[PDB]
Nucleic acid binder design. Structure first.
Ligand SMILES: [Mg+2]
Ligand SMILES: [Mg+2]
Ligand SMILES: [Mg+2]
Ligand SMILES: [Mg+2]
Ligand SMILES: [Mg+2]
Ligand SMILES: [Mg+2]
Ligand SMILES: [Mg+2]
Ligand SMILES: [Mg+2]
Ligand SMILES: [Mg+2]
Ligand SMILES: [Mg+2]
Ligand SMILES: [Mg+2]
Ligand SMILES: [Mg+2]
Ligand SMILES: [Mg+2]
Ligand SMILES: [Mg+2]
Ligand SMILES: [Mg+2]
Ligand SMILES: [Mg+2]
Lengths: 206, 56, 141, 63, 145, 56, 63, 143, 70, 55
RNA sequence: UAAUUGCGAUAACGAACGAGACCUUAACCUACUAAAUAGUGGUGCUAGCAUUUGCUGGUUAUCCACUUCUUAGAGGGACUAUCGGUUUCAAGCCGAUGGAAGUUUGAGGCAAUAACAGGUCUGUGAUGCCCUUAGACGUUCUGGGCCGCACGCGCGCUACACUGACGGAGCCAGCGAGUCUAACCUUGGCCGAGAGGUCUUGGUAAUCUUGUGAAACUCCGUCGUGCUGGGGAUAGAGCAUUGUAAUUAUUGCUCUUCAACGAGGAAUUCCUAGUAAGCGCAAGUCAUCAGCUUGCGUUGAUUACGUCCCUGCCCUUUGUACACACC
């Protein structure tokens, strides 16, 4: 890879991978394809990044929320619940860990497992509250692809945050533990349960 | 002297505050219109803008 | 007297000023090398200019930086900007236009607010709440 | 939303009214024209008037 | 640090100072459960006793244990600061004391009764089962006794 | 009959949990003065629009 | 599980009393030329892809 | 190549310098160590037992090396943390004047610092000498 | 204060023969084996690393990751 | 300051500000022009100070 | 359209107050005018490490040059521009590129006619009238009270912890303020665990406090789910500080005591981007006392970009026996 050294030194593992491939902390943004229909154009993965922290403004326009990296979007939704508002550094660290933990289990790409876990927990359709007067029934509507991702994310995070309460197990562990099961739904995870149970009710009015 | 520039300009302002007041309670019968203060060495000039100056 | 340029970058309230002269390619910030920084969770953030443009290109130039104001994260985005801008400020007065515009092509294709200074800024809080938008609690009766 | 006030549109009408000569589809030079040709108390105001004289000009060229 | 083994020597729940002490919890914090010793106090005394802080309560060969008994009820002869102790200047013999275990329960009542026997307002306050520290009692303190 | 213990065993008067009591809001716009000034006495002070010509 | 893939054709209007629902017409990428209007949940633009958990049915008005 | 302490990163400089003053024994540790809380803003004394004066001194050294002149009051403010006032909100509070000042004297007698003009303390010419030393010896662990 | 705080020579060998087949090993992982409270866990990690049997892929406080010897 | 004299009403505050501009120029001059330049070029309400020498 | 903002329809045409313009503040200037009270480069003087030229500092004036960073005068800039979608191809709207900036650029200030028996006689030597005026409802001094405690209501603060406490250590802002006939902001050196004490020093302030090294946050460890080392109520005992005075404990420090609270029912507040929320700082108040307020910067999300369902309020239409106008 034609190593280059100058006055203030840049280390080997640093020099090498960086210029070669644009990949993650160290994980490949290549491969990692969205295994489901729709859900593409709503999951980012190329353009690749280094760390999940970014100063970009996705809030000034409607759908540009989606153009954000789906790994980052996972991190953002981590930092919340009061005390953890802010603290991207807290989350971004946990994320990199979670990837290391997912990577340990069944190999593949932690970043791809993220994709699988998200695409698998998205509700296909759901029920709103339509008044109809007085006692209100539930109309089955099919959820938008954009909301489908968003929902998956908050679902996973919530489910891990709740499992990570009052137990020795850490966030990066519970997050991984969720993402691992959410990759191919085992119905052992908070999200897969709730997603499908929204679709069970969506099918119970139709 | 020995003041801050800050406390000066504020306290200067208050000076014009009390000044204009004193004249307004005095020369109203003369049609007092307000005042101005000119800061110079050797002198401090105050000019009465009252409409009827024959009574001032 | 050797060929040299000076730039800056500003994120939030932070300002990073950087001198680019011709050198054997030391890259330093304040007193320490670019290899330290720390926050360090973001360490790769400020490396990014050295990456997009290739780890060479710095061998004929020394880069020194210093960061005042802002905050822990805010400065980091400002230094990298002063870095990438300074590298493209050096091809402005010295090297070539065609290489220069192949540099802003290498940056802005990807970027993250790189040659472009981020325009966001704290909004003044007004009375009626603890925050800018946020109001106080009212109980009615 | 961005909707020019009456005073902009009213000024702009009269402008195109007495000067079609000069006054191209370029705002920039129309702006420069304004300072020479018209008396406006503010930079901001003048541009809003030039922007719209240009917008009306642009659509006169077709119909 | 290292991986310890021992044999059968470690015991759970050793009793001292007229109270009970969990053996399998760290000794710095183990001692605290005694009335009159807190985290700080336990901290200083254990260090003084030439005891390894990494050790647990179930550890600590008997001599080390009994040593700790001495330093606690006799802090001043063992060179402890005298501002580090709860009862100092006393009210009577003027001596600085560190009152411990079941004995600290008494030295509350003694004091309370002093101000009560004297009929001082602070005392009067206590006897009424009120907040004595001159705090507003209108909104706060509803459940209580 | 002194100290917390006594009062604790006592029942709390129900004027403790009561309302605002209002007392004369909906009567506001109605003048209780019984007086009501008169049209002449008004036009003396403020003039009447019938004489405006001789005002101007 | 008879999976059904549909591409949003046009954006129609906001139904529902709350307004969360948005009417839209779609097209299947398996055997196109048949268009059916469906009810969404979240935000929606043109050329999106909806997953219908059953093929043939539709609603119209919501309260 | 040549070395400055600026080449060594933050923490790992001070860890090594700590082991250095430790390995030495020329310290002047006041002796009220282990009984002291290092700030009013703190719950517990430092966990190091025998130690941590080395950490602070070594920290103190590096800081004064970094800059022109530093005083006690600046160390009180720097090392100071956020005291919880209990049920009342947090506020920043200064660390102990004695620990820090006694650190400056303990190092001055040892000769890593000298009382500077204008105020405060300046890093001694022999301070830089033995700071850059062990600084370079840190890079010999990673060589 | 429920088990897992002490050495118990039978626990030592318990670790030694049970660490293989662990794809994931950590502080929390060691507690899930019905043993090894947190203090002794973080010591156990360093001493399993003394010779082989675990490869640190991780770094620090709040997260520990080790994998089977190869 | 709160606008209202009393306590009634929503809590409206008001921020009054006064703006102080300070300018200083350096000159090397004889005894005449300084004394000639200082009496005149005066203004009603602009503070003018002439400090002397280096110390 | 945020707008009686416009377009269009038109017995109307063309107008003015209000909205808009305007004003301030936050954004953009390697282009103009400059700076030892802002700052960079080069050189003398000068220290450390490496030596092959290097790397990292000191030196209120040892000089020379400069204005990128700082500063504020004067100008420039945006006018939703270019192009393209959609619409009476009208005002507009939306998307994309460029751009410091395209949500009225963000945020404020100003803000017509009119209404209320809204609040304020307890801000006023603004005031009608009433009351009182020497045993005073004037005024002053002493002590007490506004804090009193079975309880109901409201704004907050701190917590229930492992996105954590704790111990080391990395160490980063902005808006302010600061002493003359004076004791304000306070660096530094000593003494002290701390609180603080003492000798001095800079500063009427871009000059000194002060880079306000603030906090959250980042790192390495100790703790391991157990009301535990989470939490700090309550209370005992001692030392300090403000003030003539601290008892009903002004605040500050140290030890000990170690409560309730294991995510909170019916209800209900606030909010759409550097916003929310988490965090500390400065200012007002201030001899002493912030859990308050007014500003400030730090870290920085999830979710809308819609509808009239709830609520609230405008607008017509319609009724009227109200016009002191449904009190
Ligand atoms: Mg205890
Ligand atoms: Mg600090
Ligand atoms: Mg600290
Ligand atoms: Mg400039
Ligand atoms: Mg763009
Ligand atoms: Mg009334
Ligand atoms: Mg009044
Ligand atoms: Mg009161
Ligand atoms: Mg900490
Ligand atoms: Mg003492
Ligand atoms: Mg406890
Ligand atoms: Mg605690
Ligand atoms: Mg909750
Ligand atoms: Mg204050
Ligand atoms: Mg108040
Ligand atoms: Mg009618």
């Amino acid at each position: 890879f034609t190593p280059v050294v100058l006055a203030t030194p840049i280390p080997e593992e640093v020099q090498q991978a960086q210029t070669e491939i644009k990949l993650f902390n160290k994980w490949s943004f290549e491969e990692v394809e969205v295994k489901d229909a729709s859900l593409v154009d709503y999951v980012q993965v190329r353009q690749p990044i280094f760390v999940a922290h970014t100063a970009g403004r996705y809030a000034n326009k409607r759908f540009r929320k989606a153009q954000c990296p789906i790994i980052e979007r996972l991190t953002n939704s981590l930092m919340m619940n009061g005390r953890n508002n802010g603290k991207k550094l807290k989350a971004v660290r946990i994320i990199k860990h979670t990837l290391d933990i997912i990577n340990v289990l069944t190999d593949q790409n932690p970043i791809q497992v993220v994709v699988d876990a998200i695409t698998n927990t998205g509700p296909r359709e759901d029920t709103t509250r339509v008044g109809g007067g007085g006692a209100a029934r539930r109309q089955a509507v099919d959820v938008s692809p954009l909301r489908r991702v968003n929902q998956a994310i908050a679902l996973l995070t919530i489910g891990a945050r709740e499992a990570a309460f009052r137990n020795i197990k850490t966030i990066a562990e519970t997050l991984a533990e969720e993402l691992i099961n959410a990759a191919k739904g085992s119905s052992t995870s908070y999200a897969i349960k709730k997603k499908d149970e929204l679709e069970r009710v969506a099918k119970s009015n139709r | 002297a020995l003041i801050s520039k800050k406390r000066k300009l504020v306290a200067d302002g208050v000076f014009y505050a009390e000044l204009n007041e004193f004249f307004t309670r005095e020369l109203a019968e003369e049609g007092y219109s307000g005042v101005e203060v000119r800061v110079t060495p050797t002198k401090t000039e105050v000019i009465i803008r009252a409409t009827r100056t024959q009574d001032v | 007297a050797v060929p040299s340029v000076q730039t800056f970058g500003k994120k939030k309230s932070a300002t990073a000023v950087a001198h680019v002269k011709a050198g054997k390619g030391l890259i330093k910030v304040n007193g320490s090398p670019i290899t330290l920084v720390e926050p360090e969770i973001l360490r790769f953030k400020v490396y990014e200019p050295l990456l997009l443009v290739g780890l060479d290109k710095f061998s004929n130039i020394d880069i020194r930086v210093r960061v005042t104001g802002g905050g822990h994260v805010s400065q980091v985005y400002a230094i990298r900007q002063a870095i990438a801008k300074g590298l493209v400020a050096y091809h402005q007065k010295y090297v070539d236009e065609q290489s220069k515009n192949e540099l802003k092509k290498a940056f802005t294709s990807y970027d993250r607010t790189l040659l472009i200074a981020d325009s966001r800024r704290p909004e003044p809080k007004k009375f009626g709440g603890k925050g800018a938008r946020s109001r106080f609690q009212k109980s009615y009766r | 939303g961005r909707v020019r006030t009456k005073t902009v549109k009213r000024a702009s009408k009269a402008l195109i009214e007495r000067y079609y000569p000069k006054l191209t589809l370029d705002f920039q030079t129309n702006k420069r024209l304004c300072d020479e040709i018209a008396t406006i108390q503010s930079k901001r105001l003048r541009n809003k008037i030039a922007g719209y004289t240009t917008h009306l000009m642009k659509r006169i060229q077709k119909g | 640090s290292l991986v310890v083994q021992e044999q059968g020597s470690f015991q759970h729940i050793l009793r001292l100072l007229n109270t009970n002490v969990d053996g399998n919890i760290k000794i710095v914090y183990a001692l605290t459960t005694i009335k009159g010793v807190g985290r700080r106090y336990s901290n200083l005394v254990c260090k003084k006793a030439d005891v390894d802080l990494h050790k647990r309560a179930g550890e600590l060969t008997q001599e080390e244990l009994e040593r700790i008994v001495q330093i606690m009820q006799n802090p001043t002869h063992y060179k402890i600061p005298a501002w580090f102790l709860n009862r100092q200047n006393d009210i009577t013999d003027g001596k600085d004391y560190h009152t411990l275990a079941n004995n600290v329960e008494s030295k509350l009542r003694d004091d309370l009764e002093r101000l009560k026997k004297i009929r001082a307002h602070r005392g009067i306050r206590h006897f009424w089962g009120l907040r004595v520290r001159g705090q507003h009692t209108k909104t706060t303190g509803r459940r209580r006794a | 009959t002194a100290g917390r213990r006594n009062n604790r065993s006592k029942d709390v008067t129900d004027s403790a949990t009561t309302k605002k009591s209002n007392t004369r809001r909906a009567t506001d716009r109605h003048s209780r003065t019984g007086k009501t000034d008169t049209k002449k006495k008004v036009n003396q002070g403020w003039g009447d629009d019938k004489k405006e010509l001789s005002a101007e | 599980t008879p999976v059904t893939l549909a591409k949003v054709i046009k954006v129609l209007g906001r139904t529902g009393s709350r307004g969360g629902v948005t009417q839209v017409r779609v097209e299947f990428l398996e055997d196109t030329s048949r268009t059916i209007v469906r009810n969404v949940k979240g935000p929606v633009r043109e050329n999106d892809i909806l997953v219908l958990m059953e093929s043939e049915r539709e609603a119209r008005r919501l309260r | 190549p040549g070395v400055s302490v600026r080449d060594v990163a933050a923490q790992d400089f001070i860890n090594a310098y700590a082991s250095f003053l430790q390995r030495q024994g020329k310290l002047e540790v006041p002796g009220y160590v282990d009984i002291v809380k290092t700030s009013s803003g703190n719950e517990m004394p430092p966990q190091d037992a025998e130690g941590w004066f080395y950490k602070r001194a070594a920290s103190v050294a590096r800081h004064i090396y970094m800059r022109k002149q530093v005083g006690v009051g600046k160390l009180n403010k720097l090392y100071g943390g956020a005291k919880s006032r209990g049920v009342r909100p947090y506020k920043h509070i200064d660390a102990s004047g004695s620990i820090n000042r006694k650190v400056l004297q303990a190092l001055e007698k040892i000769g890593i610092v000298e009382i500077s003009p204008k105020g405060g303390r300046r890093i001694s010419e022999n301070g830089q000498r033995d700071l850059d030393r062990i600084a370079a010896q840190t890079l010999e662990e990673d060589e | 204060a429920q088990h897992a705080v002490i050495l118990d020579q039978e626990k030592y060998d318990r670790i030694l023969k049970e660490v293989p087949t662990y794809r994931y090993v950590s502080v929390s992982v060691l507690v899930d084996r019905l043993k090894i409270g947190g203090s002794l866990a973080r010591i156990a990690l360093r001493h399993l690393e003394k010779e082989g049997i675990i490869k640190p892929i991780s770094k620090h406080s709040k997260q520990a990751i080790y994998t089977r010897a190869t | 300051t709160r606008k209202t004299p009393n306590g009634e009403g929503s809590k409206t505050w008001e921020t009054y500000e006064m703006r102080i501009h300070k300018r200083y120029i350096d000159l090397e001059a004889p005894v005449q022009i300084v004394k000639r330049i200082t009496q005149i070029t005066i203004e009603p309400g602009v503070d003018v100070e002439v400090v002397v020498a280096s110390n």
